[PDB]
Design a protein around this ligand. Sequence first.
Ligand SMILES: CNC(=O)c1n[nH]c2c1CCC2
Length: 165
Amino acid sequence: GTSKLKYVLQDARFFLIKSNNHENVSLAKAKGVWSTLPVNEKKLNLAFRSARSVILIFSVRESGKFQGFARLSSESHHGGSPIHWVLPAGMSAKMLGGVFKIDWICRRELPFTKSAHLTNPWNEHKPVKIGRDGQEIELECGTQLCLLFPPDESIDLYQVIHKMR
Ligand SMILES: CNC(=O)c1n[nH]c2c1CCC2
């Protein structure tokens, strides 16, 4: 069904995450974590305090697809176990901010060809696939995008619902 999913997404905020590579999304899927540049870390922390759910929707650059979506379960925090992210030519690990804990809602991919009817008002009504890392996606667009993903029957949203407060 889709009823618990719709409940989790009700009044949520949504952010597009553009990963440079598949490895970092693989790490995020395995460890339930994400880290971003301080400019986006501050925005995500503000949103986490401000909304019942904050959803990250992931896309690996040049893949032509989204790789899934997840809900923040914490603000960013430092001092945890290190994560060996793959970072660009000349960027150090301390350039990233703290670590956000995330609960995956869907680990399956969605090709951009299937979201071509969805535009994001907060990015000039461009197709939702278009945007910089951290671009916020307006509520209706983000909800419809998340509902397009194939169902992930490995997921149980019961425990996610209990975290909402
Ligand atoms: C896991 N997080 C990342 O891979 C990331 N987030 N922001 C930026 C990067 C690399 C380049 C800038």
